[model samples]
Structures are given as C-alpha cells and as structure tokens.
Target: ALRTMVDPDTCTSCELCYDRVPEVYKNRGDGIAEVVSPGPDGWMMVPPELEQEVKEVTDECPSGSIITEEV
Candidate 1:
C-alpha cells in the first residue's frame, strides 16, 4: 500500500508512531523512529488496509520525519 521512511537526522523520538503502529515502526534503544528489519534505509513496505493507522501517525508526526507515499 505504501513505502515509508524516517530520517535519522529528523526524528525527534517523540514516540508517537511506534506507539500507534509497532508492527511497522519502533522507538529503538537509540531513541529514533526505527523501521523494522524488513526495510532498509529507513524505508519500509506497509501492507494495505493498515495504511489508515499508519497515516494517522504520519499525519500526527510533528517532526515530519516519517514520510510515506503510495508506490
């Protein structure tokens, strides 16, 4: 449904997205919004039907570090 990325230099570690969608994102020990292992370069493939939840967090991200788009 979408591909997402969280910039290492941009994430504020506010922990909102991970709290909302731990299946795709995690607030790692380093306090960055870490994309789970299935992805590289912070970009992860999100399945369909769950974009709503992910969208919510992406929209809610104040730092705008979480970026996503249909591809």
Candidate 2:
C-alpha cells in the first residue's frame, strides 16, 4: 500500500487535484489542497482503486505538490 500527501507550503491551489481526485484531495476551506481526513497529519493512504488517478494527478500538479510512498 501507499500513503499520499500534498505539501502545503508548495501547493499552488491550482484545483487540479481536487477537481481530478476528489476522493483523496479537496480544498481545505482556505483553498489549499489537503489530504482528506486520512489521518491527523496530512499524510493518508491511497485507496487501492485511486492509485492510478493519484499518480496522474501527482504528475499533473503544476507545483508538483503531491507525493506517494510505500507504507
């Protein structure tokens, strides 16, 4: 399995992530992208089915804010 996170400091709020992968990402009310409730921290495990889309969105982010890692 893999865990994912969006680096808040570097995220551009471009909306690409929330728009494309709402299951894993969303506007944090302040407009910064955030990992949805996956944990107390910003990191969250990527859902099995969403892994591919997660990858695509990661690459698509203009600021390159998304990251996935083995857990």
Which candidate tops TM-score? Answer: 2
Q: What is the TM-score of each candidate against the true structure?
A: 0.87, 0.89
Q: How many backbone clashes does candidate 1 have?
A: 0
- Residues 1-48, model 2: lDDT tens digits: 878999999998899999888999999988799988667776889889
lDDT against the true structure, each candidate: 0.82, 0.88
Q: Give me the overall lDDT of model 2.
A: 0.88
- Which candidate wins on lDDT? 2
Q: Per-residue alpha-carbon lDDT of model 1 for 1-71, expressed as tens digits?
A: 68887777899999888888998898778888877754546578887877888888889999998888988
Worst 10 residues of 2 by lDDT: 35-44
State candidate 2's TM-score: 0.89
